[PDB]
Amino acid sequence: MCLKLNLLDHVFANPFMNAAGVLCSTEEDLRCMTASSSGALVSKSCTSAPRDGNPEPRYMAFPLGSINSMGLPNLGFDFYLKYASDLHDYSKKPLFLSISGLSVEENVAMVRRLAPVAQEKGVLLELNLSCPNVPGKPQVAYDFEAMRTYLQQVSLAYGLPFGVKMPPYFDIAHFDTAAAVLNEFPLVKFVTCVNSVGNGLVIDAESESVVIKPKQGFGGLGGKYILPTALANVNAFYRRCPDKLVFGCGGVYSGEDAFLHILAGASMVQVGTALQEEGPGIFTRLEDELLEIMARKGYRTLEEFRGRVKTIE
Amino acid sequence: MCLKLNLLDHVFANPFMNAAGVLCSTEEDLRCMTASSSGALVSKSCTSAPRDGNPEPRYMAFPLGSINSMGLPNLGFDFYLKYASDLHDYSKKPLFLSISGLSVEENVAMVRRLAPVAQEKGVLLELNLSCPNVPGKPQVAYDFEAMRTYLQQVSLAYGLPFGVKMPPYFDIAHFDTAAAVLNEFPLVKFVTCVNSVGNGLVIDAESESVVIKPKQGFGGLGGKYILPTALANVNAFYRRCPDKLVFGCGGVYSGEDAFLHILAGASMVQVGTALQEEGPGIFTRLEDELLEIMARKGYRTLEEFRGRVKTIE
Numbered sequence A, B: 001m002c003l004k005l006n007l008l009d010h011v012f013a014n015p016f017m018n019a020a021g022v023l024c025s026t027e028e029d030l031r032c033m034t035a036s037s038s039g040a041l042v043s044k045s046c047t048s049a050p051r052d053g054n055p056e057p058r059y060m061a062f063p064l065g066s067i068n069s070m071g072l073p074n075l076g077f078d079f080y081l082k083y084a085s086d087l088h089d090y091s092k093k094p095l096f097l098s099i100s101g102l103s104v105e106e107n108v109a110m111v112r113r114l115a116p117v118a119q120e121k122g123v124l125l126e127l128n129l130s131c132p133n134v135p136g137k138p139q140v141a142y143d144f145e146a147m148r149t150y151l152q153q154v155s156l157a158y159g160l161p162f163g164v165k166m167p168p169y170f171d172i173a174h175f176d177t178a179a180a181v182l183n184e185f186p187l188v189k190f191v192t193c194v195n196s197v198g199n200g201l202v203i204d205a206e207s208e209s210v211v212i213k214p215k216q217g218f219g220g221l222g223g224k225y226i227l228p229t230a231l232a233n234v235n236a237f238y239r240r241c242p243d244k245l246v247f248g249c250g251g252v253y254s255g256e257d258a259f260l261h262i263l264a265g266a267s268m269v270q271v272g273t274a275l276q277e278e279g280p281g282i283f284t285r286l287e288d289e290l291l292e293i294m295a296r297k298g299y300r301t302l303e304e305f306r307g308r309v310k311t312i313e
Ligand SMILES: Cc1cc2nc3c(=O)[nH]c(=O)nc-3n(C[C@H](O)[C@H](O)[C@H](O)COP(=O)(O)O)c2cc1C
Pocket: A019, A020, A021, A022, A044, A045, A059, A066, A068, A070, A072, A098, A128, A165, A194, A195, A196, A221, A222, A223, A224, A226, A249, A250, A251, A252, A270, A271, A272, A273, A274, A276
């Protein structure tokens, strides 16, 4: 029994990968993820130019998860494109490249250059829609008209199958609206649910202080805090986007947690906080734990249970 | 060293109270809360007519928190108003009455009849905005225009200081907008942050099933899951509504958790899931725990540290 699967005209050894932003910013990171047992890797969300990001401390982890306000530190698009074009070993696993420009024009500029490399090498685009918006408006994916514009412009500029990374939603009307927007775009072939739970606040009782420096301690939450949110979003989009794949991200620390994401509808399962905390050895543990649960239940394939969460009555 | 508060023209022995919906639906529940060591109590959010609520199971709890889709089961406004006007012993502690009508007219009708009882007996109104309006539209406090309408109409109809129960927000632009709406209304004297984190999904791995029956298993999350979200909202509104009080709700299981809420800006501290799980004995534990932290730190009163969370550099 093995976890190999085929999606987006690629073969994957298993459904696990890193979450964008974790262990994927530098060439060293990308080589380390490539050497791991993960089924795929994604690169850090990039801008056209390099960014130093926010002042430190900008990430912290705790027993129940993590908080971050990184400020999108990254080596710039030219680096990531070079990695995709010249450095990645596609014989080891597929590569996703994440883009998060500060405007629609920057995204369009980047995707027009990516497209030929996508054709040549098969790198897959993940568009991060938790990017900033015009003044006074929330992140792009929380502004449905902006999201529709970004996707129209990217679809036109890129012209190839791509995916989107979504923030969590918390309201059923919002699930309906967001999914309806995505379903306007046939090139959007996967939806990754979810980015961090925005603008939480961790306070240390001893020091009476916040634990990250940017944004007066506010930052995105990941880890155990966010698993039921993540599952909800995976399933909501699984149900609403039948012609797309859903990738799960949020709260995965174990093969049990991965199993839940796949029950909810996930094709690939992304690992953020737990990977940051445990390191790339986590992939072997997650694979073994997932196969152990499958074996106990009599499942031989992921397809036997993906999306098959039961409802009551 | 003391946990006393004087706010809203009332005196509170301590900051702890139930969260609306927990241990507060029946006369028996209200008498139980009144007999406890809590500093106040809030009655179950009510509608004009009694409601049975949703089919069971509709609440479940787990080590990290709870999920619910109760469907607002309640004994109807007239019951709660009778409790406030005739049954409650105000010499024991103050009473809040929560209202959550299904339309702006339903709320108006209730608050018109609550006003004379508020004036005579000093019951305090908490309006739940983290609540449905038209199906297919977001909850009221996720629709800023509806929120404004509700607050305009209830302010006109009621004519007395009241507070609002708010869902969590996850985007700085939303914190800014929501607080701006609230700040238009001088009769909104307190803001309770937060209601549950909406529409999460818990799945049981053994049974491969959701754990609540309504909404295909989707429901609001409480408890450990939501503490950093809760803190964020408390602090965000604390910063943005300097002429209002903020009451904290979310993730309180210990005096340490209370202490964090209070550092963030909370005046009263409400206890939902942990109360539901442990029962009213939790209040003596929380009081003792909080006094222990204050003694170690040399704080004599709650105002010495309320809102005094430190930021980095
Ligand atoms: C330090 C850090 C940096 C991240 N940067 C990115 C990013 O560049 N792009 C993105 O799509 N998500 C980013 N994320 C979000 C993660 O990809 C993931 O959606 C989130 O952490 C939830 O997963 P988890 O519960 O496994 O942490 C970042 C998360 C962390 C912790």
